[PDB]
Structure 1
Amino acid sequence: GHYGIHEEMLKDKIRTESYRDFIYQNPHIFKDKVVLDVGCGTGILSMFAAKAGAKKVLGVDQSEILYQAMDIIRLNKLEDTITLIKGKIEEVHLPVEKVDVIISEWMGYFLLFESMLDSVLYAKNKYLAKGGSVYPDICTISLVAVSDVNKHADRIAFWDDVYGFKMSCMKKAVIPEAVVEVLDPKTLISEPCGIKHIDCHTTSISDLEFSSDFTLKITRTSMCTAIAGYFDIYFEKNCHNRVVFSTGPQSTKTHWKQTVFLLEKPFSVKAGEALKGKVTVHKNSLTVTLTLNNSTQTYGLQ
């Protein structure tokens, strides 16, 4: 219901200008089409689609924000193009059988933490016309190795001596919590490894639980203290002007930052080493099981 999350999303220029660039630079995708905006929030993506020449835009949001979207759409005189419907996309009555295009910003931290993709996929299976399109269409998840003994000490070792007192028992509560923060790209000590490719046209709900064996190509002899996760978002299908953005630490920071899994036992790596591990994602919410250097830890996102 609250606007704070909407302000954070809207003020992310990488996020919001990627969507704008996609829609405005590929207007043939929207021209005289019926568009569904799943979880439309303030309705900005619905308005971009109307500006690109949409015949009709259905903006669906379950929360109080939809009342603000109703006012925003009237303030921009688009009420003849954009219809707003309050409710879960799984429950609402749409005034059409099918839609030509689905658009959504459904992505969570590490792509899948508190993500809306389940609801986007429900909307796809129920409402997308034969030969229609869903955007963004292609997503990847990547891991990269990190060396940051100081950040590791600030989070873990800290608990050994707190103003003269032992609190070492606190570390077992800290290690299993993934950290969302922007990484200094100087602390990256491997090439990235892709662990997941999603095409929204063909992926099912069951595909979003997955396991990947990975190889981190180590680029610096150092103490590996953490594995960082991030994701890349692609607008491809039928585009003359393809759009991509990365939430990786080598790219301009976004509100998604990067997801960091601290190692209980940091371990030394060598430039040239092929560091092999296994990662598994499970839902209910989201957990990430990591095996590396012959130990295993499951992480969750608070």
Structure 2
Amino acid sequence: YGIHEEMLKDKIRTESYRDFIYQNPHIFKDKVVLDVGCGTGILSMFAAKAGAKKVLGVDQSEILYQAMDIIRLNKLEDTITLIKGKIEEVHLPVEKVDVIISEWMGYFLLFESMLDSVLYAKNKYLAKGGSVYPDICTISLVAVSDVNKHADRIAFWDDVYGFKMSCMKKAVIPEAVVEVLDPKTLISEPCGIKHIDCHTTSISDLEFSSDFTLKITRTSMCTAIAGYFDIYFEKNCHNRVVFSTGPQSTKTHWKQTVFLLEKPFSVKAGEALKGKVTVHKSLTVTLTLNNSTQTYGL
């Protein structure tokens, strides 16, 4: 229940979806809409208000029972039908749908995300000429300098209340951190490492490699690499909607994902820093930079 309240209070997330739906009613007017992982059913109710003919909300979680009561309190049961279960298992009362909407995104976009479900739903249920929203996603990396925070996580273990705990460093390094970053600590321009169009993407496309270049903007000690993602509502929209989960933008519940570097190294403003990143499916992230390679998990 906690997460749903948090997600609803995430204004950037929820109002982006609201605006997309309300400002593009033509996408919904008299349409059949599927809401994959509907939670409390908020997106389905948006879709109904924007003039959807039928809305099907699917979720495996016990939140669905609350969704049912919520739909009744708003007198929408004649438009919105809720079904408990995994999208891959449930039986729908229609063969095809016109529009798929979902808030599926995880930390670093892909960690524990529902994208597999959305893609499954797209392939089985989306009608010819149909649409999936949000339709476009990108992932970006950005270099960080924060010697003090690095010291708090790493050098910290050298002397703990007068005792050596150095071996613990090996255990902190592989754990990606979900946290809001001070944007002043960013020492490079961002670099996109992934672009996903939900209309063309397959499940195999979610495991990917990318070479990247970080355009350094401040001479400093690089201590970590941060990742985040942008969400776009584009196809057939008169009013496009974008939101970023990056540190230069208002915080969201996704915050940013931080991959700590074991051995910080100096960089110079104007320098082009090259590395390589690979994502495998929980998810892991393999980072090569400055001739070090580390695999991270969440």
Q: Secondary structure at the match of 1:164?
A: coil
Deviations 1:39-96 (A, max 9, x none): 0000000000000000000000111111100000000000000000011000000000
2:163 & 2:8 partners in 1: Cα distance? 44
Q: Is it true that 1:286 corresponds to 2:273 in the alignment?
A: no
Among 217, 225, 228, which residue is 1:227 paired with? 225
Residue 174 (structure 1) shift = 0.2
Q: Distance in 1 between matches of 2:155 and 2:24?
A: 51
Decide which of 160, 164, 167 is 2:165's aligned counterpart: 167
Corresponding residue to 2:127 among 126, 129, 153? 129
Whole-Å separation in 1 of the counterparts to 2:135 and 2:55: 19
Provide TM-score, normalisation by structure 2: 1.00
Q: Deviations over 1:165-209 (max 9, x none)?
A: 111010101000000000000000000000000000000000000
2:270 is paired with a residue of what secondary structure? coil
Cα deviation 1:228-248 (Å, max 9, x = unaligned):
000000000000000000000
Q: Please report the RMSD computed on the Cα atoms of aligned residues, expressed in angstroms.
A: 0.3
| Structure 1 residue matching 2:129: 3-state secondary structure | strand
Query: In structure 2, the residue corresponding to 1:253 is in which secondary structure?
Result: coil
**Post-superposition shift, 1:280?**
0.2
Whole-Å Cα distance in 2 between the matches of residues 178 and 161 of structure 1? 23
Q: Distance in 1 between matches of 2:38 and 2:143?
A: 36
What is the deviation of 1:33?
A: 0.1
Aligned-pair distance for 1:162?
Answer: 0.7
Residue 160 (structure 1) shift: 0.7
With normalisation by structure 1, the TM-score equals: 0.98
CA drift of 1:131 comes to 0.4
- 2:269 counterpart SS class: coil
- Point out 4+ residue stretches in structure 1 off by more than 3 angstroms: none
SS in 2 for 1:166: coil
Q: Note the C-alpha offset of 1:21.
A: 0.3
Q: Tell me the equivalent position of 2:29.
A: 31
1:81-117 CA-partner distances (Å, limit 9, x unpaired): 0000011000000000000000000000000000000
Between 155-164 and 134-143, report the one with greater CA deviation.
Answer: 155-164
Cα distance, 1:267 vs structure 2: 0.2
Q: How many Å apart are 1:288 and its aligned residue?
A: 0.3
Equivalent residue, structure 1, for 2:244:
246
SS at match of 1:31: coil
Q: SS of the residue aligned with 1:154?
A: helix
Query: What's the CA shift string for 1:136-187, capped at 9, x where partnerless?
Result: 0000000000000000011111111111111101010100000000000000
Name the CA distance, whole Å, in 1 between partners of 2:29 and 2:58: 20
Q: How big is the shift at 1:254?
A: 0.3
Secondary structure, aligned partner of 1:191: coil
Counterpart selection for 1:16 from 14, 23, 31: 14
Gaps (5+ residues) in structure 2?
A: none
Q: Secondary structure at the match of 1:249?
A: coil
Please give the secondary structure, in 2, of the residue aligned with 1:255: coil
1:199 aligns with 197
1:57 to 55, 58, 61: 55
> How many residues align structurally?
298
The Cα shift of 1:276 comes to 0.2
Distance 1:33 1:84 in 2: 17
* Alpha-carbon separation, structure 1, partners of 2:294 and 2:283: 14
Gaps of 5+ in 1: none
The equivalent residue for 1:277 is 275
Aligned mates of 2:82, 2:23 — CA distance in 1 = 25
Alpha-carbon deviation of 1:18?
0.2
| Cα distance in 2, alignment partners of residues 195 and 270 from structure 1 | 22
Q: CA deviation at 1:28?
A: 0.2
Q: Which residue of 2 aligns with 1:183?
A: 181
- Match of residue 65, structure 2, among 55, 64, 67: 67
